[PDB]
Design a binder for these strands. Structure first.
Length: 72
DNA sequence: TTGTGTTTTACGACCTCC
DNA sequence: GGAGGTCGTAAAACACAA
């Protein structure tokens, strides 16, 4: 959810907050999630998923770094 | 423009956890 | 008694050289 829009761009504000809390801890907790969702106007499920996407982004960034250590 | 390669939301299938 | 982890991918959104 939702899905009358295939997917929705989160605001610069919303992404800033999520990137900051991600630096604080890579796995959000049930309470933190509940709080962030409410302060940011997104659902628990959207935070949940965002966190899942961001750790995949990190894994993808990390493999690239590793490939660059390997070539250098 | 465009067209093509990358990044950002959302999900399904499947797995792990006493 | 279910939450939340990954992997892989669709589609929309964006970046950018040609």
């Amino acid at each position: 959810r939702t899905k009358d829009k295939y997917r929705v761009v989160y605001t610069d504000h919303q992404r800033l907050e999520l990137e900051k809390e991600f630096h604080y801890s890579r796995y959000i907790t049930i309470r933190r999630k509940a709080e962030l969702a409410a302060t940011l106007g997104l659902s628990e499920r959207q935070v949940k998923i965002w966190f899942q996407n961001r750790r995949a982004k990190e894994r993808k960034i990390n493999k690239k770094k590793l490939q660059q250590q390997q070539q250098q």
